[PDB]
């Protein structure tokens, strides 16, 4: 079926007491980074948000180890996002009988860790082939093995997708 089933662990923190903007400031830096680098960075960052985000990422790495069997060395943070949570309002008095509204923003954070090495067989093997060679090699195998070969990250990384549907190499 899809790459998302093979490579991915998803972890949601719910209701962290960071406001979405603050937390975003940290999450933008760790997007696309090796799990190692992201660790040490998040240990030494000045921001407050860094600590909850840290607990989160450590967790998601543990999940990829103990659940789906991945190597921690090969984890990168592939997709990370922060969405707004439930806002708690409180009213405080101002000068001269006026009030004002304080919001105590929460957030959900979603980190999606993605193994690099998984698929590497098909990956490098398909890199090995020139563009003609590959089409000659795919002239043998049934619809089954075609779909099984090319179901790696390959078609996306090199941007072949709409080309191969045009070469009649596939069915949708």
């Amino acid at each position: 079926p899809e790459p998302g089933k093979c490579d991915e662990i998803t972890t949601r923190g719910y209701s962290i007491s960071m406001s979405v903007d603050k937390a975003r400031r940290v999450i933008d830096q760790i997007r696309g980074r090796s799990y190692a680098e992201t660790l040490m960075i998040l240990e030494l960052m000045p921001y407050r948000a860094c600590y909850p985000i840290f607990k989160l990422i450590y967790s998601a790495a543990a999940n990829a180890s103990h659940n789906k069997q991945f190597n921690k060395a090969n984890l990168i943070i592939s997709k990370a996002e922060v969405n707004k949570g439930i806002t708690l309002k409180k009213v405080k008095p101002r000068a001269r009988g006026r009030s004002y509204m304080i919001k105590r923003p929460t957030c959900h954070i979603t980190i999606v860790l993605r193994d690099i090495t998984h698929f590497d067989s098909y990956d490098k093997f398909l890199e090995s082939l020139t563009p003609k060679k590959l089409i000659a090699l795919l002239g043998l195998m049934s619809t089954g093995r075609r779909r099984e070969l090319l179901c790696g990250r390959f078609r996306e990384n090199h941007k072949i997708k709409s080309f191969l549907y045009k070469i009649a190499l596939f069915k949708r």
Binding site: R25, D28, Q29, M40, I41, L44, M45, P46, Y47
Partner: protein
Amino acid sequence: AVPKKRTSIYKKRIRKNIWKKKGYWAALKAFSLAKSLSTGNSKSFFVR
């Protein structure tokens, strides 16, 4: 003085991105510092 209008979506996204870029320079300092404490050779620095 007040805001005669409301700030348009895209411009606001640009200003807040500017404020998010400081996170980029902070992440660089943090990385360099980590690689300095990761050799245990610094006599100017201390951790416990």
